[PDB]
Ligand binder design. Structure first.
Ligand SMILES: [Mg+2]
Ligand SMILES: [Mg+2]
Ligand SMILES: [Mg+2]
Ligand SMILES: [Mg+2]
Ligand SMILES: [Mg+2]
Ligand SMILES: [Mg+2]
Ligand SMILES: [Mg+2]
Ligand SMILES: [Mg+2]
Ligand SMILES: [Mg+2]
Ligand SMILES: [Mg+2]
Ligand SMILES: [Mg+2]
Ligand SMILES: [Mg+2]
Ligand SMILES: [Mg+2]
Ligand SMILES: [Mg+2]
Ligand SMILES: [Mg+2]
Ligand SMILES: [Zn+2]
Lengths: 68, 96, 100, 55
RNA sequence: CGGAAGGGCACCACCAGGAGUGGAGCCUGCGGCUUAAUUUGACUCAACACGGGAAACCUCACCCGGCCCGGACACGGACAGGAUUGACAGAUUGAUAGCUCUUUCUCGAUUCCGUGGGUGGUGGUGCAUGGCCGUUCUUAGUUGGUGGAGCGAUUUGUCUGGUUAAUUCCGAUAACGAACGAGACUCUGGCAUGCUAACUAGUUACGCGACCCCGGUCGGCGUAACUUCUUAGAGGGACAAGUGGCGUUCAGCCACCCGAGAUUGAGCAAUAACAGGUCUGUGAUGCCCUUAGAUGUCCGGGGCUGCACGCGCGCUACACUGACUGGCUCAGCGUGUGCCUACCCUACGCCGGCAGGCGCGGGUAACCCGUUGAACCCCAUUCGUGAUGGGGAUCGGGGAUUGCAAUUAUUCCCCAUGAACGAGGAAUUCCCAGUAAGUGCGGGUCAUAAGCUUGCGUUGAUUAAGUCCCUGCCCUUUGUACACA
């Protein structure tokens, strides 16, 4: 068959090293904290986190969304 | 094939608990009737049991619209140490 | 105390040999039995084009399947006639037993 | 999403809903008395099921 | 094979006829044109209402777009400091396909990347095939063994004659003994007042009820006999048996008595074949093609219905032997609540002109639909030879049902529109007794569903008991320069 444009490009995973570094408070004072928001998910109580953008929060396993 | 390993060990668990496996030729029907305890479609699979066939662990026959698969002695030895079963955990094939 | 069996099959001679050797036993078990009452026989007809494709003379098979069925009544207690339900059975006949 | 869309089309009716119970074929089906097998497969299996041509 | 001869045969031949068809409108298939695609197979019998092919989607194989891997397995790679799943917004899309784009999250060895290979295909090849079907070919034909005749291919048996539906028999006989086909066979139709039996079939009695005038009607209600009607089993029955002619007095034929039947209709169907059809029935299948930007598969839309022409199968008709409107009165086959699987057949009450709808019930069925109140036919009205109240194409407006969705109108209704068509050229099809023909009802197809097909009844003939003229078939003899004939 003939075609029209070049093929629609597949979504690529942007390779980031240590993808947990956006999340926790590491300092010489003996503290630990969370940068992003914890999920209010019923099935995932306090395990994982949201996708804090500048616009809205997203958690993955529950597909949860809380905007502003 | 992509599938949870939980669905995968439920399939091999049924293949152990009765040493055969039957599936209607349907890659569209929502769920296996015997395996209604798990969220496993016939779409979610018959081709992995073909994978056991193509590795040599089951032998396949295909009547009218229904696959049938049979466990082998080559297959039981692999599957028990895939599902981390001892020699004490055996099918109806090893027991009277 | 009044039971009724329905004998249903496709082959009439092995239906009516069961339907006779049950009645012969029922008359020597000192009962009051009504004999075979014969329902009209259900012939199942399928007319089909013989050719797998659409070529040739338009020829048709007229396949048939005749199903025969009897009623036998027993004015008898149950275990007095529960032998003949599970004895004198041949692999062709289905039995449908009712009481009420 | 493909997983919630691959089997959302309603084939609850039509001849796409049905197939031969020997062939998985969609034409020549005999639904009479629930045979649900195509005309040529029924030609193959009519004596085996018990339909004798005597007329 | 013969536009050679002899003997027979067949309404896919003819005669005598019947209904037609070919003429018109429409349906539907085919060709052609057109188109993004108008998918394709089949082209004398033996393609052309065929592929069970009545396609809105699906089907679907065609076309225009967009997803998915549903690429097993092996090897090497990356890979828990993450191989990779999935995604709400907002763009984008046709779309609530995270299909992609920007943003980040989630998921956790199930994967992915390559390399070999595999899988799938309504892709091709029926001129590679199997199976099935059709056809030669509905006629009577075909073949061994042993023996005989020929160098042989071959021939005889398998035939001069009579006879038969028949290579069916008698008979003849270098053949004898056989095998298939034919016949026999199974189903079906017709017949039993004798058998078996019947609260899921009834009949007759008797009791009661209702209406009329002791009786009559009642599919109104109920129980003592019986199986005539019904059901379906066992048997019986019919054999050219009996009589009279014809006949080698054989094989057999004609007519008649007695009787239900003195020829019911099918099914199965030999050897050899055919480049017949089917790869689009198949997880029957060789080879080839293709395999992630797919000829896999899915979704959305469209096409298969497209329209200067030609053809085939059909339906409606061209009217008074009819139409319309009332009344009356009779069937036989069936099918029916589904492994997936949603979709059954309907009694009856009420609302609605109508299609329909809203409620309770029965039936997995000789139980309910149902006593299947079918049509044609029959009796009574109105018409009046007028393209008329024949005919109902085309087209307009509205109303219901099925469906996720009906527009290129799914189907059904209502009103209105009221075309050709005045019995069809050359030509040509099917058929002889419950036959043709008319007439409706089932089944299949079916969510909605018959102008088709397969069955069933109902009403029911004209003509024929023959021939080889036409078209073909069989046998023998004969001729041949034919032998893919
Ligand atoms: Mg004749
Ligand atoms: Mg004539
Ligand atoms: Mg015409
Ligand atoms: Mg249609
Ligand atoms: Mg589609
Ligand atoms: Mg379509
Ligand atoms: Mg295929
Ligand atoms: Mg062929
Ligand atoms: Mg050919
Ligand atoms: Mg078409
Ligand atoms: Mg007029
Ligand atoms: Mg009219
Ligand atoms: Mg002719
Ligand atoms: Mg048709
Ligand atoms: Mg000469
Ligand atoms: Zn089939």
């Amino acid at each position: 068959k003939s075609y029209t444009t070049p093929k629609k490009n597949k979504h690529k995973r942007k390779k980031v090293k240590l993808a947990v570094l956006k999340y926790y408070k590491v300092d010489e004072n003996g503290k630990i904290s969370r940068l992003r928001r914890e999920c209010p998910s019923d099935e995932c109580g306090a395990g994982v986190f949201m996708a804090s953008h500048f616009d809205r929060h997203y958690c993955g396993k529950c597909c949860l969304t809380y905007c502003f | 094939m992509l599938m949870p390993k939980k669905n995968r060990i439920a399939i091999y668990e049924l293949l152990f608990k009765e040493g055969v496996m039957v599936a209607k030729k349907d890659v569209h029907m929502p769920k296996h009737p015997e395996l209604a305890d798990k969220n496993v479609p016939n779409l979610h699979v018959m081709k992995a049991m073909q994978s056991l066939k193509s590795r040599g662990y089951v032998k396949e026959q295909f009547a009218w619209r229904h696959f049938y698969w049979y466990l082998t002695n080559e297959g039981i030895q692999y599957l028990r140490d895939y599902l981390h079963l001892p020699p004490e955990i055996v099918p109806a094939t090893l027991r009277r | 105390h009044r039971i009724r069996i329905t004998l249903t099959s496709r082959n009439v001679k092995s239906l009516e040999k069961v339907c006779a050797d049950l009645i012969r036993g029922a008359k020597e078990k000192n009962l009051k039995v009504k004999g075979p009452v014969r329902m009209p026989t259900k012939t199942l007809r399928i007319t089909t084009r013989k050719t797998p494709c659409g070529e040739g003379s338009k020829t048709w098979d007229r396949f048939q399947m005749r199903i025969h069925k009897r009623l036998i009544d027993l004015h008898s207690p149950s275990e007095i006639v529960k032998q003949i339900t599970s004895i004198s059975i041949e692999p062709g006949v289905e039995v449908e037993v009712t009481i009420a | 999403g493909h997983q919630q869309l691959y089997w959302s089309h309603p084939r609850k009716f039509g001849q796409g809903s049905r197939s031969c119970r020997v062939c998985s074929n969609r034409h020549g089906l005999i639904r009479k008395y629930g045979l649900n097998m195509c005309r040529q497969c029924f030609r193959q299996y009519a004596k085996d099921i018990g339909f004798i041509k005597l007329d």
